[PDB]
Amino acid sequence: SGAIYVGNYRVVNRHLATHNDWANLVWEDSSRDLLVSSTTAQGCDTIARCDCQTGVYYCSSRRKHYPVSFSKPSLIFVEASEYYPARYQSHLMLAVGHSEPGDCGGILRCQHGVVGIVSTGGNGLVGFADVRDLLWLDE
Ligand SMILES: COc1ccccc1CN1C[C@@H](C(N)=O)CC1=O
Ligand SMILES: [Zn+2]
């Protein structure tokens, strides 16, 4: 689990969105595994606006943060789960690291701010849904 709070928005994994997230929907993209809902309280996370390929992510199944090198956002094949059939997920970045389903929502950060959130895993890889292109999150 985990979310990003920036301005009047909450960014979550689309497959983990709650009833309140869907009742306050701003934008959702199934191909990205992202959903953004509106909030009443002001968030103060900072979104990175950069092309970093190194950062640190939080892994709840190890209660640890790990430094990683990650690929640029791209269209990657993701195996079927209970939430989606096998498909290409867009705007996904991979790194070598540990990730279990409950790790979704953990933040990946670089020196500039929040880069994305854990969205995939298995086979010793971890995948993060990028949010750096969503420039409207700041206005
Ligand atoms: C071994 O499976 C995982 C490991 C870590 C994280 C997630 C999974 C399996 N996923 C992938 C998600 C997606 N983005 O399509 C939905 C889901 O349940
Ligand atoms: Zn950066």
mmCIF file of C-alpha atoms and ligand atoms in Angstrom:
data_model
loop_
_atom_site.group_PDB
_atom_site.id
_atom_site.type_symbol
_atom_site.label_atom_id
_atom_site.label_comp_id
_atom_site.label_asym_id
_atom_site.label_seq_id
_atom_site.Cartn_x
_atom_site.Cartn_y
_atom_site.Cartn_z
ATOM 1 C CA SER A 1 0.000 0.000 0.000
ATOM 2 C CA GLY A 2 0.978 3.662 -0.321
ATOM 3 C CA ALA A 3 0.058 6.938 -1.999
ATOM 4 C CA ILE A 4 1.573 10.278 -3.148
ATOM 5 C CA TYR A 5 -0.038 13.458 -1.748
ATOM 6 C CA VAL A 6 0.607 16.608 -3.851
ATOM 7 C CA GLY A 7 -1.593 19.715 -3.712
ATOM 8 C CA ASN A 8 -5.268 18.665 -3.780
ATOM 9 C CA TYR A 9 -4.427 15.222 -5.311
ATOM 10 C CA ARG A 10 -3.818 11.661 -4.086
ATOM 11 C CA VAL A 11 -1.968 9.292 -6.469
ATOM 12 C CA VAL A 12 -2.500 5.568 -5.890
ATOM 13 C CA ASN A 13 -2.121 2.238 -7.764
ATOM 14 C CA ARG A 14 -5.354 1.944 -9.805
ATOM 15 C CA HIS A 15 -5.809 -1.699 -8.644
ATOM 16 C CA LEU A 16 -5.669 -0.615 -4.981
ATOM 17 C CA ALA A 17 -8.006 2.456 -5.309
ATOM 18 C CA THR A 18 -10.746 2.645 -2.689
ATOM 19 C CA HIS A 19 -14.508 3.500 -3.055
ATOM 20 C CA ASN A 20 -13.703 7.107 -1.913
ATOM 21 C CA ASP A 21 -10.883 7.350 -4.542
ATOM 22 C CA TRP A 22 -13.409 6.386 -7.293
ATOM 23 C CA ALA A 23 -16.121 8.751 -5.850
ATOM 24 C CA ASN A 24 -13.549 11.656 -6.069
ATOM 25 C CA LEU A 25 -11.943 10.532 -9.375
ATOM 26 C CA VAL A 26 -9.779 13.106 -11.245
ATOM 27 C CA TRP A 27 -7.983 10.780 -13.768
ATOM 28 C CA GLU A 28 -7.296 7.056 -14.166
ATOM 29 C CA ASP A 29 -5.305 4.984 -16.692
ATOM 30 C CA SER A 30 -5.603 1.178 -16.614
ATOM 31 C CA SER A 31 -2.638 0.789 -18.989
ATOM 32 C CA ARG A 32 -0.493 2.702 -16.404
ATOM 33 C CA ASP A 33 -1.969 1.167 -13.192
ATOM 34 C CA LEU A 34 -2.559 4.758 -11.944
ATOM 35 C CA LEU A 35 -5.509 6.581 -10.423
ATOM 36 C CA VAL A 36 -5.630 10.156 -9.063
ATOM 37 C CA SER A 37 -8.362 11.316 -6.683
ATOM 38 C CA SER A 38 -9.116 14.715 -5.129
ATOM 39 C CA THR A 39 -8.461 15.546 -1.448
ATOM 40 C CA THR A 40 -9.716 18.272 0.910
ATOM 41 C CA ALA A 41 -6.381 18.574 2.789
ATOM 42 C CA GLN A 42 -3.316 20.005 1.030
ATOM 43 C CA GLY A 43 -0.499 17.571 0.259
ATOM 44 C CA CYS A 44 3.140 18.606 0.357
ATOM 45 C CA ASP A 45 5.094 15.858 -1.471
ATOM 46 C CA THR A 46 7.351 17.186 -4.304
ATOM 47 C CA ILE A 47 7.179 15.490 -7.758
ATOM 48 C CA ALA A 48 10.505 15.127 -9.614
ATOM 49 C CA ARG A 49 10.700 16.772 -13.101
ATOM 50 C CA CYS A 50 13.804 15.087 -14.543
ATOM 51 C CA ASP A 51 15.225 12.071 -16.412
ATOM 52 C CA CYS A 52 17.056 10.447 -13.433
ATOM 53 C CA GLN A 53 17.734 6.722 -13.695
ATOM 54 C CA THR A 54 18.948 6.289 -10.066
ATOM 55 C CA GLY A 55 16.975 6.682 -6.838
ATOM 56 C CA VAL A 56 15.757 4.958 -3.656
ATOM 57 C CA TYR A 57 12.519 3.009 -3.099
ATOM 58 C CA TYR A 58 10.640 1.846 -0.036
ATOM 59 C CA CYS A 59 10.061 -1.958 0.171
ATOM 60 C CA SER A 60 7.404 -2.768 2.794
ATOM 61 C CA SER A 61 8.099 -6.564 2.639
ATOM 62 C CA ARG A 62 11.644 -5.859 3.905
ATOM 63 C CA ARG A 63 10.842 -2.644 6.031
ATOM 64 C CA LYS A 64 13.792 -1.133 4.121
ATOM 65 C CA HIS A 65 14.740 1.426 1.517
ATOM 66 C CA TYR A 66 16.969 0.283 -1.355
ATOM 67 C CA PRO A 67 19.071 2.353 -3.800
ATOM 68 C CA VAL A 68 18.455 1.256 -7.430
ATOM 69 C CA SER A 69 19.279 1.978 -11.067
ATOM 70 C CA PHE A 70 16.043 1.931 -13.177
ATOM 71 C CA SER A 71 15.112 1.964 -16.822
ATOM 72 C CA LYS A 72 13.354 4.982 -18.543
ATOM 73 C CA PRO A 73 9.518 4.773 -18.692
ATOM 74 C CA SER A 74 8.467 2.326 -21.377
ATOM 75 C CA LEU A 75 5.852 -0.231 -22.589
ATOM 76 C CA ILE A 76 6.573 -3.511 -20.771
ATOM 77 C CA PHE A 77 4.762 -6.877 -20.801
ATOM 78 C CA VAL A 78 3.263 -7.664 -17.370
ATOM 79 C CA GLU A 79 2.079 -11.185 -16.493
ATOM 80 C CA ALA A 80 -1.569 -11.763 -15.502
ATOM 81 C CA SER A 81 -2.641 -11.198 -11.873
ATOM 82 C CA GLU A 82 -6.026 -11.134 -10.056
ATOM 83 C CA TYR A 83 -6.347 -7.445 -11.134
ATOM 84 C CA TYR A 84 -5.489 -7.557 -14.854
ATOM 85 C CA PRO A 85 -5.056 -10.083 -17.655
ATOM 86 C CA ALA A 86 -1.519 -10.320 -19.203
ATOM 87 C CA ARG A 87 -0.924 -7.019 -21.003
ATOM 88 C CA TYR A 88 1.530 -4.261 -21.878
ATOM 89 C CA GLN A 89 1.731 -1.661 -19.064
ATOM 90 C CA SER A 90 2.893 1.763 -20.266
ATOM 91 C CA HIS A 91 5.136 4.340 -18.463
ATOM 92 C CA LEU A 92 6.768 1.514 -16.439
ATOM 93 C CA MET A 93 10.400 1.529 -15.189
ATOM 94 C CA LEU A 94 12.224 -1.622 -14.042
ATOM 95 C CA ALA A 95 15.026 -2.213 -11.594
ATOM 96 C CA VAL A 96 16.704 -5.263 -10.029
ATOM 97 C CA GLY A 97 15.218 -5.608 -6.573
ATOM 98 C CA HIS A 98 12.622 -7.177 -4.319
ATOM 99 C CA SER A 99 8.881 -6.559 -4.780
ATOM 100 C CA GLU A 100 5.796 -8.545 -3.604
ATOM 101 C CA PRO A 101 2.155 -7.502 -4.390
ATOM 102 C CA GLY A 102 1.691 -5.703 -1.036
ATOM 103 C CA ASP A 103 4.746 -3.571 -1.833
ATOM 104 C CA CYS A 104 2.654 -1.653 -4.446
ATOM 105 C CA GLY A 105 2.442 1.989 -3.468
ATOM 106 C CA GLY A 106 5.966 2.302 -2.097
ATOM 107 C CA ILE A 107 7.607 5.497 -3.327
ATOM 108 C CA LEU A 108 10.667 5.722 -5.604
ATOM 109 C CA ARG A 109 12.522 9.056 -5.069
ATOM 110 C CA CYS A 110 15.512 10.726 -6.681
ATOM 111 C CA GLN A 111 17.352 13.940 -5.623
ATOM 112 C CA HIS A 112 14.521 15.984 -7.319
ATOM 113 C CA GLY A 113 11.546 14.386 -5.565
ATOM 114 C CA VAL A 114 9.010 11.565 -6.113
ATOM 115 C CA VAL A 115 9.576 9.633 -9.368
ATOM 116 C CA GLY A 116 6.847 6.997 -9.114
ATOM 117 C CA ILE A 117 5.332 4.138 -7.083
ATOM 118 C CA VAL A 118 5.888 0.377 -6.998
ATOM 119 C CA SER A 119 3.474 -1.320 -9.427
ATOM 120 C CA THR A 120 4.985 -4.714 -10.526
ATOM 121 C CA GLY A 121 7.440 -7.390 -9.409
ATOM 122 C CA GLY A 122 8.628 -10.963 -9.382
ATOM 123 C CA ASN A 123 11.711 -12.798 -10.766
ATOM 124 C CA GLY A 124 13.963 -10.447 -8.785
ATOM 125 C CA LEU A 125 12.712 -7.342 -10.598
ATOM 126 C CA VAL A 126 10.676 -4.375 -9.294
ATOM 127 C CA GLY A 127 8.615 -2.109 -11.585
ATOM 128 C CA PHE A 128 7.575 1.484 -10.857
ATOM 129 C CA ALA A 129 4.727 3.451 -12.456
ATOM 130 C CA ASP A 130 6.220 6.827 -13.452
ATOM 131 C CA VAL A 131 4.458 10.071 -12.442
ATOM 132 C CA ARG A 132 7.107 12.637 -13.672
ATOM 133 C CA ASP A 133 5.213 13.311 -16.905
ATOM 134 C CA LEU A 134 1.954 14.340 -15.048
ATOM 135 C CA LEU A 135 2.762 18.024 -15.006
ATOM 136 C CA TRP A 136 -0.785 18.963 -13.982
ATOM 137 C CA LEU A 137 -0.256 17.385 -10.503
ATOM 138 C CA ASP A 138 1.454 20.737 -9.537
ATOM 139 C CA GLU A 139 -1.266 23.135 -10.697
HETATM 140 C C1 LIG B 1 4.422 -11.250 -8.411
HETATM 141 O O1 LIG B 1 3.422 -10.252 -8.680
HETATM 142 C C2 LIG B 1 3.653 -8.979 -8.219
HETATM 143 C C3 LIG B 1 4.741 -8.622 -7.436
HETATM 144 C C4 LIG B 1 4.873 -7.312 -7.004
HETATM 145 C C5 LIG B 1 3.928 -6.369 -7.346
HETATM 146 C C6 LIG B 1 2.837 -6.726 -8.123
HETATM 147 C C7 LIG B 1 2.683 -8.040 -8.576
HETATM 148 C C8 LIG B 1 1.509 -8.477 -9.424
HETATM 149 N N1 LIG B 1 0.693 -7.363 -9.918
HETATM 150 C C9 LIG B 1 1.171 -6.499 -11.003
HETATM 151 C C10 LIG B 1 0.204 -5.314 -10.904
HETATM 152 C C11 LIG B 1 0.086 -4.567 -12.225
HETATM 153 N N2 LIG B 1 0.637 -3.357 -12.251
HETATM 154 O O2 LIG B 1 -0.431 -5.096 -13.219
HETATM 155 C C12 LIG B 1 -1.085 -5.971 -10.415
HETATM 156 C C13 LIG B 1 -0.569 -7.078 -9.535
HETATM 157 O O3 LIG B 1 -1.197 -7.691 -8.681
HETATM 158 ZN ZN ZN B 2 15.652 13.271 -10.603
#
